[PDB]
């Protein structure tokens, strides 16, 4: 990565940390923040390093490759190239392949990221990767929010835990999530807690609901 | 974080440390100082990083989200925005969403924290988070201070350990805690130790009590 600006190699325990995360948590939602946390200020070379070091899960890595290709082609479409020799006091504009680091050298990425004004190629590639990881996490969710129903002997806290776990997995827009929380959460509770939640009212906070069905 | 001022990424073993703390201790009181200790000088991006990397416990994380939203709306209420173009030698004032890092870039947070005079957005967001964690820890306490009573075969030291454990969990004000220590601690001891503590007097220190019922 490049930290405040000096450039360092990706540390061993960052690599081992990312490999261990992929091995342990597979494609749980929290894998995506951890990824983002293990790659702050990272160049495209570091991002490709993290992705290439993943063993197995080659179907998801192939889907991620396809997503990266789509985002690259879209970038090249929105940024047409202009012919002409590069001036001695300037540097070329990156293509879609240069953002991914496939056709760009390390010092070209450094020169892009440290220039005034800056061209944040690492963060662009990073948000492309995070898009692909979003598609993977959403696809690999085994459950649907419609099937999360509270058991007759189940405490309210565990039911809410399952509900917001699946909800985080589905990655719907905040309005749709608002509707699922406002309707399904109270709707799919067990009879007693459901009655109490109905008595609480439409605009109750989650804290009031949990302490009410406690 | 930003240490003396240079900016660094959140280290891998800080992440792994926080994840291990959440996995092991769940929402024990000491989780909150550890959190504060793992996030000194942290930007909002680092705080959101720590929160997002929590797997499971999504009910508590949702309550924490609600608390953060409330504190943000209150901040925006106490700080009304003024229209006008930002001067070349100044920078905009953050909203409630900028403190949480949802609508603020990393370099905007850095520019807020390193400016003269400083705007400590990381510590504001941090104290909001700590508020929410306080509500979570208080709610998840299984015991009440009224139910901590010394057994007939129980040594005094273990009884005091349980008592101040629950007391730390309840998070009442220092005056109420003073009353609970002054009344309940001696009140709920076993007959013999209770008599000895009565004979000690009203203004005895905890050391004198423990060495008296030793």
């Amino acid at each position: 990565p490049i930290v405040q600006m000096v450039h360092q190699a990706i540390s061993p325990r960052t690599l081992n940390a990312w490999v261990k995360v992929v091995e342990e948590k597979a494609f749980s939602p929290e894998v995506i923040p951890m990824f983002s946390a293990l790659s702050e200020g990272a160049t495209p070379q570091d991002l490709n390093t993290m992705l290439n070091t993943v063993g197995g899960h080659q179907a998801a890595m192939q889907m991620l490759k396809e997503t990266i290709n789509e985002e690259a082609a879209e970038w090249d479409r929105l940024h047409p190239v202009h012919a002409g020799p590069i001036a001695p006091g300037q540097m070329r504009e990156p293509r879609g392949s240069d953002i991914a680091g496939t056709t760009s050298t390390l010092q070209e990425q450094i020169g892009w990221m440290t220039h005034n004004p800056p061209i944040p190629v690492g963060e662009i590639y990073k948000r492309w990767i995070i898009l692909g990881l979003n598609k993977i996490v959403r696809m690999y969710s085994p459950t649907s929010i419609l099937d999360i129903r509270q058991g007759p002997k189940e405490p309210f806290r565990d039911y809410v835990d399952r509900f917001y776990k699946t909800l985080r997995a589905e990655q719907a827009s905040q309005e749709v999530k608002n509707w699922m929380t406002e309707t399904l959460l109270v709707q799919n509770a067990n009879p007693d807690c459901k009655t109490i939640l109905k008595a609480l009212g439409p605009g109750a906070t989650l804290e009031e609901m949990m302490t009410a069905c406690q | 974080p930003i240490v003396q001022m240079v900016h660094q990424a959140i280290s891998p073993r800080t992440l792994n440390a926080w994840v291990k703390v959440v996995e092991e201790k769940a929402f024990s009181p000491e989780v909150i100082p550890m959190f504060s200790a793992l996030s000194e000088g942290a930007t909002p991006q680092d705080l959101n990083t720590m929160l997002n990397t929590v797997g499971g416990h999504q009910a508590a994380m949702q309550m924490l989200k609600e608390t953060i939203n409330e504190e943000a709306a209150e901040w925006d209420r106490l700080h009304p925005v003024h229209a006008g173009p930002i001067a070349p030698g100044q920078m905009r004032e953050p909203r409630g969403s900028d403190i949480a890092g949802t609508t603020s870039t990393l370099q905007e947070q850095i520019g807020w924290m390193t400016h003269n005079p400083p705007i400590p957005v990381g510590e504001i967001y941090k104290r909001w988070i700590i508020l929410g964690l306080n509500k979570i820890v208080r709610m998840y306490s299984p015991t009440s201070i009224l139910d901590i009573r010394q057994g007939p075969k129980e040594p005094f030291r273990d009884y005091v350990d349980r008592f101040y454990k629950t007391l730390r969990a309840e998070q009442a004000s220092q005056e109420v805690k003073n009353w609970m220590t002054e009344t309940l601690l001696v009140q709920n001891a076993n007959p013999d130790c209770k008599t000895i503590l009565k004979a000690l007097g009203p203004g005895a220190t905890l050391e004198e009590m423990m060495t008296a019922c030793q």
């Binding site: 898009l131 979003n134 990655q171 | -």
Partner: peptide, 9 residues
């Protein structure tokens, strides 16, 4: 398209 898993980020 998916909105992401960053609840607080």
């Amino acid at each position: 398209s998916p909105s992401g898993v960053f609840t607080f980020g």
